[PDB]
Homo-oligomer: 727 residues x 4
């Protein structure tokens, strides 16, 4: 045949390229020389296509893939067409059950490398030499929605990493907030059922804004700490690259001398912390529901690889009871002001998968998968997690051999006496299938614990008590961490939290649930309670106004590490800018703009009111990437408007909406020359206003002004003015 | 631990060795140099064990595989023990459903090779050149019983061969008789349910001798032909090596010029045809329920490779309507007297599997798996089979990617647009997942039909008729094939047929069923029915005595290729002999005996009343293989008793009973010198008789008379004496 | 067509009859009047048959159940025959995985009744009153063999009882000897793999007489006690009725005041103890592989009901 | 069979016919109905061949396909009328 175009423009270049410049593609067609041990190891299973014949799964060549075998050309389909029945049979069985929680997620390959040897504190082999590189596969996700729900919802986010080490698979299964909603694993099914779609009508999708979620929260004050996080702007990340990651529980690091050290795991983003604002996140679930999945893929195809540093909070065993909270209570954080995070290695994500289903959907992560050098604790939530991850996977991936699915296979050796099970791949030649045996001289054999390459042994903790079903009294305090989190937010972050609580509480149909939640907020902080109650048209009683606030945490009244914006770290590399074109761009402006952009690693998208192209004033042909309505302001970080024939787009409803939307959402805006005339549509004062960059032309002082606001993420001083702007 | 004996006798030599000499083992350790393209391609999934550490499935080394993790050495088991839970979880999910029919089966690897080119009549690549070697995987089985049922029951046998060809998998799924019980696939669940264990109490296992089977037969006369084969000695073969193989249905062979020829497939045993006699077979299901599986395996380990010749019965399309019966009716055979079998090539089975579960239990055969060069026909039993094998494999093997389990994968290339499904192994890199596509330039591509490597195209047969649920009038004759079969048996085979019917019908509880069956037998042949009637105490009515017999089949009144023994084809190689020792065997007898046997390729089993060793008269030390009770006469083909201290065993009940049981089952018996005292135990005249070899010492003709009788398989002239003899 | 004989000899009398005198049948047609509370609650799903039309599972009457739909009498089968595909689809999916261990077993319904109140030692409701009856469901089995293996092999026997009590289901899942082969659950897969058919060829069925089992026994002396029991005549009972039953583990009984008492459970057969001899038992796996199953069904049909203390 | 787990999906409460359904089909994952019929095949004399086939008729009869006329060769081809 040869249905492909002459010019070969149906295929993308195998080189780093900017978002939207080319069609995206399977990772190994796009970046064939990006290798790692896990990625080379998958070459036994990759399948090509070009130059091969079309066949059945048995290897038989198909002559006509357009028709069914029939008795006469207008006749009945014949049962003997095995070719049709095979093709329809595979199609009929394509789906497998989605994950019970965290079903919506996006993944990529990469590697980890430590900064130094950690042999003094752990015997884990992957942390033992700064030159030992460890292949990894990371999946980012939401919690509540199904596989087809939208990415920029308000929810907690999952951050799971599989380490393919030389001593076994180690999975670090975390979240993007430092604590969880509940204390004991026995309440997980109650909590998940409350936040998920209600059982009679299966509404709502991807949202906690409903009666059952808020009923459960108001009757279980242990959940309030994680609720403050979710209601904050932490709940709507701008990207998986710009959010923090946490293991949440306290684990143990075990060294070669046998000493145990308590640890909490942390992931710190090299691109900085950044979130959207609620109206923008919400509208983005309709304009581009695949926003986070798309921007991670394209970031990797552009070479803006997501980078994170691994960090440890370390507390010696003798200090277990130094804080006024329990170290095993997963609803309690460890303030970095009390115990700093030691930066210990870095992770880079530099390759997209080849097939979403084979690699992302079939991947299995489990927190119980640790390696010698690590160990658990008695945290009641982690303790119950150990049961569930293997159990769930028997039904989701079809049997006990899920470790033989290529993405899950260890890279190191695995030999034991386990046999059979659905879809067994490995063919054992061992004459023995039990131990002790003499017929194979007892191989494979057990290995004693040791400093390196030894068998797993659990840390010999002392256990003392009765068999009981009871919560520890030290876990009984629910308001001081939420209060330290409130006081560590800047003022605009505190306003975002209040609007988060108000918007969700307004969707609760039973008014008595609204009031009970509000009563709980009064125990954290009065200002906060008063604010949410003003929006719900509820009045605080006498009793509620005299409630004594909770105590501070170990003398602390605030910790700037809990805010997203208190201490700036925003980086502009990998951000995107929309450039509104008119039918005769002043080439002088464009060029100044594109070259300032490219020096800071900022991408640009050229938008017009139609597709195809437009020509500048000097005859340069500018191709259009998208239209104004097709790539809304929601999808970009800042908006620039060059000079030229402004008359061309000055009366265009969408081009004006573009500016009002981006202005409402606190994004930097730049207008040169007669583009300044757009100030009338967003009603800006005459002298000027911070956040609006303007000049006679696109000069270098003009771009430094634009790039400087962009490093600060959003224009926080504008909040006050956006109340009276209709968009 | 290092538990093997130093002397290394825990492991068998990697060379051909006689049955029982050494412990049996996985194929790649017993015969590491027996190779083929299929065996070689499985090397990617094989796993060793020697010199490796014992690990979890994630690769973590295990320090203690004897204990669970508890709180205190007498404490409760902890939930955090992920090593225990993984181990027990895999164990708990080992089983998969067994095959709905043919659950019990034994398999092996081999190769096929054509004798000459068949390009004149078919364009199937595997039959086109005498130097093309095609690797095969074969499974032999019973029908009714579960996977743990016994081997030597009375039943049809399956014979399935998977040909790993260069243009796709070809599965020839046959049976050991040339016809099946029913005409249309629509009745398969009805026929299968009648023969299987009755639904209230799930009895009986591996047997057709119960009420529902005979009820179904007496109401459906189409079953009579195959019922005659199952009640004959064809139903209890001596070994999978000594039975015939048949495709049953008429298929089509299509050449390069597009011409179609009708074909019936045949497998001819090169070791000839042999069967057991009923009381031996039934007893053998208790003393060794795995006798066929064991014999198959041991024959390959010793080098007696099962060899079969593939043969074709060829009928030109113009002869479709030339016979008394319909070619598309599977209850009718094509007599070799009318249409000779053309011997076309040979299959040799030379290596056992490594792991039964992985290669045997998971293999999937299907008659719909054909290649260009072949095609189907309108046989209604074959038509409904095409639907069933793909459907059943979806739940047995867990999903539509059953072709990715290692034993089922083709060795030739396979590429298509099918994606996902449970247990997906292949990672596709094709950017497109549909056709026609321009994004991958339409690859993979359809391929036109041609003489070699072309696409599959169905033979364009003419269909004309209305949509009807009706049986063809030409399918309506049920008695002449059964009669043709009956008249071709030898007289002693007719007697075994009578006894099979009498025995089976004696187990039918409702007497009216026995009477209707007998009636049906009177339509086939009067002598047959009078004989069955007298064993059940029934009298034929005067009307039954005058039923007119059915016609000849195209003028034939007998066809000798339908008998097992009319035209003898015995081969003594691979048969086995029992030698009963005493504490002082005449070593001159023993050396003449063992050297004659080795010269013909016959194995010996040295038996005694205890295990260990015996010292011969010249001081030679003999290792004992098994006791008289441990390896009964049911397991050997003939008995030799040598001279020596005969008083050691003259009074042992087991040694005597050993000669009475073999004598009863018509096997040859040889007595040297004073071992002749044993003649009184079996009531043999002084004069002697055919079947009893006797001499002063074990020398010259002694062994040659013995081996002549062994080539004749059983001593049919003794039938008359066995009715007395309490054995 | 194809109907019953005029004399009605196709059907069994619904009264106690001796083994072999009549055809065996489903319990509810054999003993309509035998009831307990579990048997009565199963009435919702029992399905009859006399006087009804043959249908698909969607309830459409079938006109012709002897043939496939085809283009002409000698033509090809059509894809649109949904009656044909429903029938063959259900058949193709009849089987489910057999039990990992104890795949071969035979079951029956009955009831349990206490002799006296046991509330001084336990607050278990089913044991608190002599006049309170508990419906039971019991399953006897072998250990090693598959579901189609033989009954009278040398092996341990399982004795599992489901009690449908008023405060929940209680399962007392035991064996016919008072100890097991091993001490820790961590070694279960190792012991079961050694006793089951060897992995390269899947031999032998329902027998411990092979190399891997004795290998394991010789290296793990903890197994010797139950190996003694298995090699005795306890390994080959005459019937499920003539064997003892045990819970093996020490369990605990808790009364109303919170006091605990250790307990081991026993079942005592009122027909007494009796076993076969080996030669008999081995040969009986060939002459009738279904002897213990047959014997249990037939004893209940004859009125020789299995009873245990 | 895979979405709903086996061949007894018609026993799932929402899918059940409200009219009677009797046949010789048995077993399969999650079988709810407990069949008392002594036969599980037809024809049978042990249950006097019940449940039985019903001939076609104006009402309450068995299903029979309309006897459309079929003519032509076995082809994998699109009709020219569809083009
Ligand atoms: C600290 C609290 C928890 C955290 C940080 C957490 C994190 C996660 C993450 C990130 C995933 C998705 C992994 C992937 O992308 O495939 C996940 C899945 C899952 N989690 Fe957890 N989870 C928590 C609590 C629990 C609890 C308490 C349970 C049950 C006791 C649980 C059961 C599950 C299950 C069943 C899955 C689906 C796994 C699969 O299908 O592969 N989680 N969890
Ligand atoms: C000429 C008549 C037939 C012959 C010679 C035959 C032969 C065989 C053999 C040898 C096997 C076992 C394959 C193995 O070793 O794994 C088998 C399996 C099977 N047969 Fe047939 N059969 C016949 C008729 C039918 C019919 C009419 C149907 C259904 C319409 C049917 C359905 C099946 C099924 C469902 C299996 C199990 C396949 C699997 O689980 O992979 N057979 N047959
Ligand atoms: C005192 C020791 C044991 C006794 C008396 C015992 C008894 C039994 C019995 C009587 C059955 C069959 C129940 C039925 O009729 O369905 C059974 C099945 C089973 N046993 Fe045990 N067993 C023991 C030890 C173990 C151990 C240590 C394990 C695993 C660690 C285990 C796992 C199983 C499993 C998985 C089944 C199948 C259950 C099913 O499929 O429903 N058994 N056992």
């Amino acid at each position: 045949d040869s249905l492909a175009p002459e010019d070969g423009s149906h295929r993308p270049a195998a080189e780093p390229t900017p978002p939207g410049a080319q069609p995206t593609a399977p990772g190994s067609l796009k970046a064939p020389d990006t290798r790692n041990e896990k990625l080379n190891s998958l070459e036994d299973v990759r399948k090509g296509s070009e130059n091969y014949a079309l066949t059945t799964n048995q290897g038989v060549r198909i002559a006509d893939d357009q028709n069914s075998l029939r008795a006469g050309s207008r006749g009945p389909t014949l049962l003997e067409d095995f070719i049709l029945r095979e093709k329809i049979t595979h199609f009929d069985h394509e789906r497998i059950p989605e994950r019970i929680v965290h079903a919506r997620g996006s993944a990529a390959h990469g590697y980890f490398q430590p900064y130094k040897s950690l042999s003094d504190i752990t015997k884990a082999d992957f942390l033992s030499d700064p030159n030992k590189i460890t292949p990894v596969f990371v999946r980012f996700s939401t919690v509540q929605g199904g596989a087809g729900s939208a990415d920029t919802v308000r929810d907690i986010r999952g951050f799971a990493t599989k380490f393919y080490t030389e001593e076994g698979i180690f999975d670090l299964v975390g979240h993007n907030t430092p604590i969880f909603f509940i204390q004991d694993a026995h309440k997980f099914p109650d909590f998940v059922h409350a936040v998920k779609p209600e059982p009679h009508w299966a509404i709502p999708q991807g949202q906690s804004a409903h009666d059952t979620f808020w009923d459960y929260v108001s009757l279980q004050p242990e959940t309030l700490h994680n609720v403050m996080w979710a209601m904050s702007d932490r709940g709507i990340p701008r990207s998986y690259r710009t959010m923090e990651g946490f293991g949440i529980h306290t684990f143990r690091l075990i060294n070669a001398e046998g000493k145990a050290t308590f640890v909490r795991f942390h992931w710190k983003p090299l691109a900085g912390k950044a979130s959207l604002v609620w109206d923008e996140a919400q509208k983005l679930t309709g304009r581009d529901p695949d926003f986070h999945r798309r921007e991670l893929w394209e970031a990797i195809e552009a070479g803006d690889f997501p980078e994170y540093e691994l960090g440890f909070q370390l507390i010696p065993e003798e200090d277990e009871f130094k804080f006024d909270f329990d170290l095993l209570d997963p609803t309690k954080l460890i303030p970095e002001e009390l115990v700093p995070v030691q930066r210990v290695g870095k992770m880079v994500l530099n390759r997209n998968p080849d097939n979403f289903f084979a690699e992302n959907e079939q991947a299995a992560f489990h927190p119980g998968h640790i390696v010698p050098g690590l160990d658990f604790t008695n945290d009641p939530l982690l303790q119950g997690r150990l049961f569930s991850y293997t159990d769930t996977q028997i039904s989701r991936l079809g049997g006990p051999n899920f470790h033989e699915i290529p993405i899950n296979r260890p890279t190191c050796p695995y030999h034991n006496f386990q046999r059979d099970g659905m879809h067994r791949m490995g063919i054992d030649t061992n004459p023995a299938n039990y131990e002790p045996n003499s017929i194979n001289d007892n191989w494979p054999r057990e290995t004693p614990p040791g400093p390196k390459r030894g068998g797993f042994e659990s840390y010999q903790e002392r256990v003392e008590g009765n068999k009981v079903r009871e919560r520890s009294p030290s876990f009984g305090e629910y308001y001081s961490h939420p209060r330290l989190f409130w006081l560590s937010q800047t003022p605009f972050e505190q306003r975002h939290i209040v609007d988060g609580f108000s918007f969700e509480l307004s969707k609760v149909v039973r008014p008595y649930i609204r009031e009970r939640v509000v009563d709980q907020l009064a125990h954290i902080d009065l200002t906060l309670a008063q604010a949410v109650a003003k929006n719900l048209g509820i009045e605080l009683t006498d009793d509620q106004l005299n409630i004594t606030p909770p105590p501070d945490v170990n003398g602390l009244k605030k910790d700037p590490s809990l805010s997203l914006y208190a201490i700036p770290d925003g980086d502009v590399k990998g951000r995107v800018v929309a450039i509104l074109l008119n039918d005769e761009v002043r080439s002088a402006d464009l060029l100044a703009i594109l070259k300032a952009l490219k020096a800071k690693g900022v991408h640009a998208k050229l938008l017009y009111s139609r597709m195809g192209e437009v020509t500048a004033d000097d005859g340069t042909v500018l191709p259009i990437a998208a239209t104004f309505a097709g790539a809304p302001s929601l999808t970009v970080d800042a908006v620039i408007v060059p000079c030229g024939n402004i008359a061309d787009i000055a009366d265009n409803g969408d081009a004006n909406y573009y500016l009002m939307e981006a202005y409402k959402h606190l994004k930097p805006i730049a207008l040169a020359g007669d583009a300044r005339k757009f100030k009338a549509t967003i009603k800006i004062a005459d002298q000027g206003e911070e956040g609006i960059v303007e000049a006679d032309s696109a000069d270098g002082s003009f771009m430094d002004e634009l790039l400087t606001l962009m490093a600060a993420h959003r224009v926080w001083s504008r909040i006050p003015k956006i109340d009276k702007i209709p968009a």
